[PDB]
Write a protein that binds this ligand. Structure first.
Ligand SMILES: [Cl-]
Ligand SMILES: [Cl-]
Length: 39
């Protein structure tokens, strides 16, 4: 496990990116729901 500071910064960035992407995905899903025409 030779993960030094540059490596640690990457881990943190990826965690944040991952969470924010899930939020976007959540929001886009809902955009899709309302973009449906009735019937
Ligand atoms: Cl975050
Ligand atoms: Cl996307």
């Amino acid at each position: 496990a030779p993960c030094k500071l540059g490596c640690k910064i990457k881990k943190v960035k990826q965690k944040i990116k991952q969470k924010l992407k899930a939020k976007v995905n959540a929001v886009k899903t809902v955009i899709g729901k309302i973009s449906e025409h009735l019937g």
